[PDB]
Curated annotation (Swiss-Prot):
GO terms for cellular component: cell cortex; cytoplasm; cytosol; extracellular matrix; extracellular region; extracellular space; nucleoplasm; nucleus. Changing residue 98 to A: No effect on integrin-binding. No effect on integrin- and heparin-binding, loss of FGFR1-binding, defective in inducing FGF1 signaling, cell proliferation and cell migration. This is Fibroblast growth factor 1. GO terms for biological process: activation of protein kinase B activity; anatomical structure morphogenesis; angiogenesis; branch elongation involved in ureteric bud branching; cellular response to heat; epithelial cell proliferation; fibroblast growth factor receptor signaling pathway; lung development. Keywords: Acetylation, Angiogenesis, Cytoplasm, Developmental protein, Differentiation, Growth factor, Heparin-binding, Mitogen, Nucleus, Phosphoprotein, Secreted. In the nucleus, phosphorylated by PKC/PRKCD.
Length: 140
């Protein structure tokens, strides 16, 4: 369903997922809530990515051990255990950024995305060409 242009990074270290849309870092709160924060000091923005298959990743909270996931209704949530909803297709975009597509809902083009106000976008509201879907992985 999608291209195979991969980003040049690795999973050796944890990262911050910076969204240029509103300038927020992806955050997974202890209660499972998912959103964005501009506070670089936040303890819930440190994420550990790992590869399942080439270009297939898990995005986990280093702080809580929770996995980023997208539900049946396109909502992002923090999962205690890895499941099919936790896999994302990590790709290069605009020859620079990182995008994350819901593997489970790949055919629907549901991406991980942050609005300018720091709220997460619902899968069906996302789409190729948006700024909300563009992330820059930063060192922690």
């Amino acid at each position: 369903h999608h291209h195979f242009n991969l980003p040049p990074g690795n999973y050796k270290k944890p990262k911050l997922l910076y969204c240029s849309n509103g300038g927020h870092f992806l955050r997974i709160l202890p209660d499972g809530t998912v959103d964005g924060t501009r506070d670089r000091s936040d303890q819930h923005i440190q994420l550990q990515l790992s590869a399942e298959s080439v270009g297939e990743v898990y995005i986990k909270s280093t702080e809580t051990g929770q996995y980023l996931a997208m539900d049946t209704d396109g909502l992002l949530y923090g999962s205690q255990t890895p499941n099919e909803e936790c896999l994302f297709l990590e790709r290069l975009e605009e020859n620079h950024y990182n995008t994350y597509i819901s593997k489970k809902h790949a055919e629907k083009n549901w991406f991980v995305g942050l609005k300018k106000n720091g709220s997460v976008k619902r899968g069906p509201r996302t789409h190729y060409g948006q700024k909300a879907i563009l992330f820059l992985p930063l060192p922690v």
